[PDB]
């Protein structure tokens, strides 16, 4: 079976802004006035439906996730691209994941532009909800020490 769920998490320190704006679509964004996170998902069948950005002091957890009812088309190759853009970032660079052996087909790239973050963690997680929890593919990236964001709720950007 193929994954029917994609979870993207981005944890960041330090952040100075709590207010954000979201626009989901082919190129989904979460942005504050100091950081923009841009996600693409070409040829990935599960559709991204929600996101969040929530802060405790200067620590942020954020992410995008899909509906979990439709399985990936095994005839198309899911490509997840993610870019974290700092306000005055001058040059892009690629992050390298901590593992490269996976159970399911997918490709991903994670890029950061600027050095405004002392800690940046990214997880791209593909799961077949029909399969045991330990069979998920977890693609993990860390620029520094790994942030603990346990128990920070997934508040969305809408202030209405």
Numbering used by the authors: 161 to 320
Give the text the authors published on this PDB structure:
In addition to the anti-TNF activity attributed to the N-terminal four cysteine-rich domains (CRDs) homologous to host TNF receptors, CrmB and CrmD have anti-chemokine activity attributed to a unique C-terminal extension (∼160 aa), named as the SECRET domain (smallpox virus-encoded chemokine receptor). Biochemical analysis revealed that the SECRET domain binds a subset of human and mouse CC, CXC and C chemokines, including CCL28, CCL25, CCL20, CXCL12, CXCL13, CXCL14, and XCL1. The identification of other poxvirus genes encoding homologues with the SECRET domain indicates that the SECRET domain represents a new family of viral CKBPs, which has specific folding to allow its binding with chemokines, either independently or fused with vTNFRs.
There are two SECRET domains (molecules A and B) in the asymmetric unit, related by a non-symmetrical two-fold axis with an r.m.s.d. of 0.62 Å for all Cα atoms. Although these two monomers bind each other tightly with a buried surface of ∼1160 Å2, the size exclusion chromatography revealed that it is monomeric in solution. The SECRET domain monomer adopts a β-sandwich fold, consisting of two parallel β-sheets and the connecting loops. The β-sheet I consists of five anti-parallel strands 1, 5, 6, 10 and 11. The β-sheet II outside surface is completely exposed to solvent, whereas the solvent accessibility of β-sheet I outside surface is limited by a long C-terminal loop after strand 11 surrounding the bottom half of β-sheet I. A disulfide bond, C180−C317, further fixes the conformation of this extended loop by connecting it to the 1–2 loop. However, there are several significant differences in the arrangement of certain secondary structure elements, making the CrmD SECRET domain more compact than vCCI and A41 and also directly affecting its binding with chemokines.
